[model samples]
Target: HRDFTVASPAEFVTRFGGDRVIEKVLIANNGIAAVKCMRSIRRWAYEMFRNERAIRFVVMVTPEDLKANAEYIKMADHYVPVPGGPNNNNYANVELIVDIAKRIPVQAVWAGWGHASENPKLPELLCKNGVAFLGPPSEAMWALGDKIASTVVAQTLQVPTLPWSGSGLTVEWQGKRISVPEDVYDKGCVKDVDEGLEAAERIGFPLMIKASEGGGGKGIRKAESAEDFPILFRQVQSEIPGSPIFLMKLAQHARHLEVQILADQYGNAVSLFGRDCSIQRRHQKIVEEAPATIAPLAIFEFMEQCAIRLAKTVGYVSAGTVEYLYSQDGSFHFLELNPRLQVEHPCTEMIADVNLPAAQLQIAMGVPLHRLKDIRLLYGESPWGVTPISFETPSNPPLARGHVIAARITSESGTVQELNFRSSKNVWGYFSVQFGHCFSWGENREEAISNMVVALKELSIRGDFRTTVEYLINLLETESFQNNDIDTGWLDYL
Candidate 1:
């Protein structure tokens, strides 16, 4: 380990010079679960100590009441509240942030979500005030934020993506302009509700109605019949404003995967590998694992190259996630690009052995990246290991149980702090032990059920918190999950 002396604030300013000392940094969105922003702050704190030593963080929150939360206050060095209620306009929020930015010698301002109606004005205001907006450039954000624009870029790079048509929306692509019947609005296709029903008639039943501008599965619905299409379409339209166009397509049973990537201002990009998110609820992933269990080496290689290509296509910088849908038939389709860090980033960090936030800070500081050859050399010489197991072919695939086994152990004080398996040996091998958080795995259906019972006896959360380990097990052992034929629609079956 390297040894170093800690410098005082005055010495730090003198050493790095006043120019490099960032006195204040603002994180606009405030929430304990704003994992990305929190990670960024934590990473920046370390970077400040390592590089400049004088910088400090100041988090700006819109909700004044959040200042009173013990957990929220403890996490930040300084808390500044925006001068507006929750229902205030975006422009008001921007003005409040600007006022904060001006009062403090703010070096950088980070905005979490830029596509919201209120956010488009933030970067420009920050730019005019000479604050470095630490995010994707406004133009790049605009191009990549829009689903149709991103799809067109993906198509141009020959990246594999789901079949979609932003035809009428694209003046440059000469995309075909199609209309939907008004009656179909309640079924599927809201753009020209009537025209969409006509398209659905031609496309047949069991098509998907997806919000063009939606994410987190908010505006998505699967229609099994022409009769079901209109209702789902109207439902989504009623929930989300704007005539946000919809895409119609056949649904497939596919493994959901997402890859994290980073690009430097100098145009060098690298893929940090992928996460398997096949197990999801309502199209949102709950359980995630790195070095995707179902992903093949060849598929990963192809995805890495494609991810880099897409980043270059958009002149992307900083961090982003590229989502893909992998089918059993050996096909992978590009889904969408999330232009920010994801909550599950820790899983990737665990596998990649790289501090992503540190890398972002280094890149932002204009440090030249180590040559790719050098980077490979360093990684090649690093010690690493892998675990593998093979199962004997049987008349039927083994009925695996879905058990939510918490790692809890009885303490001398007759208490449990919860246990989580952190060792490769524990996770890769079949060993029975109780330690922290609940983990899911099963040797067979019956064994999995028994495991849940054992876990419940050992692990108990403090207070009123309780988890349904048995319920999860039953759901996993259900006919749909057992047959491996579960889809987004299976939630209704529950």
Candidate 2:
């Protein structure tokens, strides 16, 4: 663990100022995806570390998680635990991060995921003190991070957004009292599964336990029966401690589509293209592909244009993704804009053939949009061509490798050995940091899925925990996905 520890923020500045500009960077997150994203974004640096030029990859993780990141340790030069002990939200953590920033002698900082990223004040604080943030300005993150603010931004662009019953990031599921006699309370979510059990019982079975934190199916669980509620509640609660958990209607029969976009401070923005991430379990994306393939070409073009407009409206900079939920009838609504690099970025990168992480860094460093990669708007016939105003790479641009697909390789234990020890009910610490490696990619959609299938089949696991690996093959090979017939609720049928 190449690192530093500080009792106070001043101790860091007392040690060293930004005068020593080490040719290195920082990625703040605790996940396997964080490692992969950093490697892809910093591939250029890792490559140049040889010829009289070098920089290290520094990461921020909880102290307890240092060893679990065996994959990152082999590659990382500096592995520092964030000052955020109990929480990364307070001023102490941010101030400590700023302190860590000055001591690094680093050029830029990429706040990839976790609570540190959601705080809009973070970018403002970092950049003001000589650190460059990897994504958009602080204000833009606010617009996108908040469910209410994003819809407002979408409205400015004339984009449609989700029609939630209420506002804010939190969900007060039982805002209205439940009439079910058995259901004790109905004026909010489960305070504890015990307090909320009566509510769930009255609300009836088939309740959704949704964690109010990050999206992309990370913290969602469904209970089909009364008995299923508490276990699922405890599980979801364990995944995200301190964060509020609530119940919501399981909106079935919907499609998940998102547009990938990159923008520079120079008012130039280009969408890499859209993706179809409908195949999901527990609200998480499993198999994702570019060009969506499910929606009409016009809808794809509209989403791209709208994303660009929304970014422009917010003065957005760097790389961001605009997500949407499409119904079976061909209507689409805005989901949210992820200001930082996405977990599904590999799918877009496979299709665009561009390093979005690197692009984010480059743009953060003031690189213009066009100079980094070319954007050719190819409009042609259906299945044979691109949309009118949207993008599909020029036949030979370094960025266009054609339709690409990526499948996440998730398993309960090490595919190589049997993991045993501690815990009554097995669970990873946080972020699924341990089991997120071994992603499979392919030029064609089917090949990528098949490649993932082969990899997972060979993978071995031994633990009480279940793996999402097996279901992937069946999900990808299903009739709907094969024919591009999908919606957000498509998984419900299976």
Candidate 3:
């Protein structure tokens, strides 16, 4: 990692041989992800500089001929149209844009959302120009981007993780080597079908094959028996070129829970709570909720502590997530740490009594938390103001606006078309709402759910957008989920 340095856009332009330093930069504006990123940055600037005259924002779009959509032009303070097209990387175009960015006196520059990591050169360019990269440093991004390095961090933090070995071969002994820990055979686990067969004979069946550098659930296969290894191993190797390392499965029936933490340079971190990501298709999370229903308070505390410890261990600073797997027996294992804000952060904000993006901005400004103990106390000791109003509770007494729920109708394009039932009441006068979408508060769960459903039904989307309310309701009703019986494997069953 490079040392933190402060340089003006002018200085950056001089060093990088650019013509201008454009402040308040927005990376892209064509796609929804880019728009969302711009919106977030704009909102953050407004919040941070709230009361101090309107702050200027410069949005950079490729294709100098590009026109700003009415939505962005209305929200952005300033717009910078650059010459380039979507996803096209001409060094000259990049240099021109970098120069333009260096000309502006920027408060903060938001890189495009979603796959920002795919733009490998963007961070270095931003760094060299003295622009504060909004997220983790480039080095941290590379480390967590590679699954092998991420797994190492997880294991070192004593987080429960799959057993893996980097590229190497395993030698077999006569008979079976049963009861031998997988870590002992760490010469890249076993290589070749005969070696794998021999190793399986010792380790038992139902193993997993994983590529060393793979991410996003690619290069992963499960082998139930010796016969399954050869094909699965080959398939995994094919998916990830040149990364010959493999990981063995440690457990099944796991429930995935992830905690989001925002840490500043001063080592202060706040656990924004956890997400119950038990519903999934493939390896992606399709349904999620905060204050994971099945995670006990003790478990929650433990995972949060582990996350902070891991961040400290890595000398990490910025907004990030620490993912974990909770077993059926309530045991939690570390999974991986994402050194960037996740797509599901909205869920955490819904449950939290604070504004998250505002916090991130404050931290980025070199603000240190005043009292660590107070922060912990606010989370741990404070009584949950919003309680779930049970249907069984007598309504004759007339419950006080006991709950509120909110939902958004997402279009097939993943955009909220129209918000319905911002607030609504149920037949019993309780609110049954979807709590996953945009932030909402309620007095009780019934009201929350009621309001959420009505809001969802009222939401109008333009195309084929699928909502997660059905899965969310199912999760709320599931015995394991309701009774706190969860682990990372719960999603696998689906």
Q: Taking the tens digit of each residue's C-alpha lDDT, what string does model 2 give over 1-494? A: 62333332233223422122334676665455456655664564543232212445676656455544445544567877654456553222666666677787666677665557656777878878888787788766654545444554465456775433121232221122111121211223456877657656555556567766635556678778777777888888778776556665454568788888888776667777777777665545666676676788778778888888777766788888888877778788877787766766766666666677766765765655544532322222232122332223433323345565555555452112222223211111122533443345555656655665555554434332346656666776787667666544456666
- By summed lDDT, the worst window of 10 consecutive residues in model 1 runs over 382-391
State the lDDT at 378 in candidate 1: 26
lDDT of 2: 0.58
**What is the per-residue lDDT of model 3 for residues 1-494, given as tens digits with 9 covering 90 to 100?**
63222244344334423333434554433343344555554554444334221335565554432442334444456666655654444222445445666776564555434444334355567678876555555655654444455555556456666544432222221221112124533444556677766656555567767765565677777788877778888888788867655556556667788887777655456576677776666554654555665667777778988888767655565678888887777788777777766655656655654445444444444544331222323444322123222211222311112322323223331211213343443311111111224333355554454444444444323133245444544444566544444444454453
Better of 1 and 2 by TM-score: 1
- For model 3, what is the error of residue 415's alpha carbon versus the real structure, in angstroms, after optimal superposition? 6.7
Clashes of 3: 47
Model 3 weakest lDDT span, ten residues long: 427-436
TM-score for each candidate, following the candidate numbering: 0.68, 0.67, 0.69
- Candidate 1 lDDT by residue in tens digits, 1-494: 64332354344334322233344566665442233455544554454456432445666544443544424334556777555465244223777676677787676665554322224456667768877555544555655645555665666567776644332222222222222223422333346557667667666667777776565557777777777777888877876667466665564767887877777666656677677677655444544545554667678768867887777666676778888888876788777787776545655554555556544544444433342222222244312112111111223222112322222122211112223433221232111122223343444334433454444433334222244333444554567645545253564567
Query: In model 2, how large is the Cα lDDT of residue 390?
Result: 25
For model 1 the local lDDT of residue 103 reads 84
lDDT of 3 at 223: 82
* Per-candidate local distance difference test: 0.52, 0.58, 0.51
At residue 12, give the lDDT of candidate 2.
Answer: 23
